[PDB]
Design a protein around this ligand. Sequence first.
Ligand code: HEM
Ligand code: HEM
Ligand SMILES: Cc1cc(C)c2nc(SCc3c(C)cccc3-n3nnn(C)c3=O)sc2c1
Ligand SMILES: Cc1cc(C)c2nc(SCc3c(C)cccc3-n3nnn(C)c3=O)sc2c1
Lengths: 49, 51, 378, 49, 62, 71, 106
Amino acid sequence: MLSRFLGPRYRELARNWIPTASMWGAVGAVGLVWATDWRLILDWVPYIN
Amino acid sequence: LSRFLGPRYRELARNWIPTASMWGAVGAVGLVWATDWRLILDWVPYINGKF
Amino acid sequence: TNIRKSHPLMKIINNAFIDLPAPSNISSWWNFGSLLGICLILQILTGLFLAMHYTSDTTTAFSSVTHICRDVNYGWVIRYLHANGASMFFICLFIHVGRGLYYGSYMFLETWNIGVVLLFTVMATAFMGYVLPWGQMSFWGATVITNLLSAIPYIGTDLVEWIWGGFSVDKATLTRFFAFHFILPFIITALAAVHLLFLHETGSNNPTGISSDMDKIPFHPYYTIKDILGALFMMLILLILVLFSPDLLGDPDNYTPANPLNTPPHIKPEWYFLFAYAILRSIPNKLGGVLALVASILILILMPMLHTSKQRSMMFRPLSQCLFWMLVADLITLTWIGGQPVEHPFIIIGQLASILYFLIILVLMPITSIIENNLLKW
Amino acid sequence: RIAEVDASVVREVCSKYFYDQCPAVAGLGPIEQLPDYNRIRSGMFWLRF
Amino acid sequence: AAPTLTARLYSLLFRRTSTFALTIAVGALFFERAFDQGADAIYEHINQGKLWKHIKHKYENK
Amino acid sequence: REFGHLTRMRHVITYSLSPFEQRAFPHYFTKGIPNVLRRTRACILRVAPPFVVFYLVYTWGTQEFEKSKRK
Amino acid sequence: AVAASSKWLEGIRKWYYNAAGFNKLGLMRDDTIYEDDDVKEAIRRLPENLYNDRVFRIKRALDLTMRQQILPKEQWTKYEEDKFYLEPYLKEVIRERKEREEWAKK
Ligand code: HEM
Ligand code: HEM
Ligand SMILES: Cc1cc(C)c2nc(SCc3c(C)cccc3-n3nnn(C)c3=O)sc2c1
Ligand SMILES: Cc1cc(C)c2nc(SCc3c(C)cccc3-n3nnn(C)c3=O)sc2c1
C-alpha cells in the first residue's frame, strides 16, 4: 500500500538529505554525553577526565 | 450630568422597582440558605433545618 | 498551504502572539504585564514544592518550616525564592497600575474592571500565606485582622469563628487558611486569561494616547525579543536577593515561634501592606476603619467617569503630571508612617496624608483637567 | 551549453545566488499586508538545511 | 582590501542552519572544563586559610 | 483586526535598509549622552519637587521623635 | 470675558502651549484629541485633503517617539499657525446628538 514512496525519482530524494542526516545521530553521541555525564565515553578522549 | 435625566429614565425605574425589590428580597432570602444564617433561621420557626 | 493559518491549534497561537498588530512606539513600561505572568508561574511551582513538606498544625507549623531549610535538599533556596518572589510580584503590580493610570488605559472598560478584581485576589492570597509559618507576626497579624473583622454589624461575629475552625487557634485552625491559600492563585490565573481576551478586541494603547492603526508592526519578532530580555533582567535582580541578602525585606521577629503569653515589641506587616495599615490607624472607629481600607482599592473603579480632559494620556498635560507624582510621593509617606509607632509626630502626619490620597483622586484631578481644556480653548 | 546542465548543477548555482542572501523589494498600491523586511529575510533560509 | 577574520564558520557549518540549532547540544562541551578555573579557584583564593579543606589536615591522620 | 484591514492611507513612502547592511553602534556615547541630557532637562521640574517634600517631612518627623525623650 | 486683563491671559495661553509639547513633534491641537464615538464621526466627514494631512502628521510623530527624538526647532508648529480644522465638524455632530436625546424624553 505504501508504494507511494516507490518511484524512480523519489529515492533520488534520499540521496540529497542523508548527508545532512548523516550527522545528528552523532549529536546524541555528544549531547547527552554532556547532559547526564556518561562515564562510558569519558574514557574515550584525553581532553576530559 | 443631564444625559440620563429626563421623564423617561425613572419612568422605567417605576416599572422596574417591582422587578427590583424582587431583585433584592430574593437575594436577601437567598443569603440565609447559603451560609446557614442562624439569627434569621428562626425568623419564622417552621424551618428547623439544623436537625 | 500555510500551516500557521489553517491548523486548529496553531491558528490561535498565531493570532495571539505571532501576527498580532502592535504599536511601534511601545516603551519598557509595557514590559511589566508579561513580568507579572512570569512571577505568577514562579510562585505556583515553588509553592507546590513547599506544600509537600508543610504541616498545618499550630504545634508543628513553625517546626516544619525550619525542617525544610535544614534537612530537605535544596529546601533553603526554594523557600527564600518564594518569600522574595512575592515581593517581586507586588513591585511589578504597582508599576503596572501606575502605568495604566498615567497613560489613560482605564478607558478600556472591561479590561480595567477585571484588573481591579485581580488586585483584591492577590492581596488576600498573600495575607493567608504569611499566617502559615506561625511565628509572632503570623499570630499578631491574624488577630488584628479578625478583631477588625468582628466590626461587621450583622454577620461579623459569625464569620470570625468560622476561619479558625470554630475556635481559637488549634490544629484544625490553619487547615482553612491553607486551603484558601492553595486555591486562590488558580482563580487568579483564570481571571488573567479573560483579562487578555478583552484587550485583544482593541489592541494596546501607546504613550501618546493617539490611535495608531497606520503604524502597526507584527508582535514577532519585535516584542518577542524585547520581552525575553526584560525577563532575564528580572531573574538577575531576584537572585541577587536570594543569594546575597535573603533576609533584607523580612522582619527578624518572625523567627520566634507564636506565643500568646510572650510579647512582641512592635507590630509591623510586610512592606507592601504598610500603606493600608496607615489608613486604618488614622480612623478612631472600627467600622469606619475597615470601610476606608476597602474604599482605597475600590476608588480605582471610578477613574473612567472622573475623566474630564479632552486628551487621553498625560504626555501633553503638564499640570496633571505634577499631581500624578504628588500622589506617588504620598504613598511613600504612608508606607513610612505604617512602620512607625503611634506617638505624636506620626499621628497627625498619618491622617493628613490619608486625606490627601482621596482629595487628589476625587477633587483636585477632575478640576485640573478642566483648567487645561480652557487654556487650550478645548 | 544547455546539454551540460543537470540537477546537481542547478542545485549548486541556486544555493550560490539565493540561499541566505538579502533581497531588494519594491511595492505599490494597497500593500498593508506586505510582510515586514525581517520576515522576508528569514524566508531566505530553511532551518533544516 | 584585506578583510578581518569574521568568516571562520559562515560557510561550512553555520550556513546549513543545523549547527545553528545544534550548538546548544554539540556546542555544550568543555566550558565546564574551563569556567571552573574561574569561579572555584577565585573563591578559594579570596578565602585563604578559612575553609574546612584548608585546615582539615591538622586534624587528620592520627 | 488583521493587517490589511486597519486604516486607509494615501501618498506616503518608506525607505529602509537591511540589518546586515548596517553597523551595530554608529553613535553610542556621542549622541547617547547629549540626548539623555535633553530628556532629563524636560522631566526634572515635574517629577523632583514632590520628592523634596517627602525629604523635608522625613527629616522633621524623625527629629520630633528623638527630642520627645531625654530633655 | 475680561477686556483689560486679556493680555495677561493671552500670555498664560502661550506658556501652556510651549510647556505641552505636541508642537515639538510637529502636531496640531486637533491631532491629539481623544477619539470617542463622537470624534470618530467628525473624522469620516472631513474632506479628502484634510484627512490625508492628518494621517501623515500622526505617523511622523509616532516615529519620532519610537526613537526618543524631536524635530529641529525651525519645524515646530507655531502658536498662531495652528488651524482648528476639526472643531466645526465636531460641533455639528454634538448638536445632532442632543436633538435625538431631547426627542426621546419628550
Ligand atoms: C496578575 C495580574 C495581572 C496580569 C498577569 C496582567 C497581565 C497583563 C498583560 C500581559 C497585559 C498586556 C501587556 C502590557 O501592556 O503590559 C496587560 C495589560 C493591561 N492590564 Fe494587566 N495584568 C494584571 C493585573 C492588572 C491590574 C491590577 C490592572 C489595573 C487595575 C490591569 C490593567 C491592565 C490594562 C488597563 C492593560 C492595557 C494597558 C495598555 O495597553 O495600555 N492589569 N495586563
Ligand atoms: C500568587 C501566588 C502566591 C503568593 C503571593 C504567595 C505568598 C506567600 C507568602 C508571602 C508566604 C509566606 C512565606 C514567608 O514569608 O515565610 C507563603 C507561604 C507558603 N505558600 Fe505561598 N504564595 C503564592 C502561591 C502559593 C501556592 C500556589 C502554593 C501551594 C500550592 C503556596 C504554598 C505555600 C506554602 C506551603 C507556604 C508555607 C509556609 C512557608 O513556606 O513559608 N503558595 N506564600
Ligand atoms: C516572551 C513573551 C512570550 C509571549 C507568548 C508573550 N505574550 C504576551 S501577551 C500578547 C497580547 C495578547 C495575547 C492580546 C492582546 C495584547 C497583547 N499585547 N500587545 N502588546 N503587548 C505588549 C501585549 O502583551 S507578552 C509575551 C512575552
Ligand atoms: C484586600 C486586603 C486584605 C487583607 C486581608 C489585608 N491585610 C492587610 S495587613 C495584615 C498584617 C497585619 C495587620 C499585621 C502583621 C502582618 C500582616 N500581614 N499579613 N500578611 N502579610 C503579608 C502581612 O504583612 S492589608 C489587606 C488588604
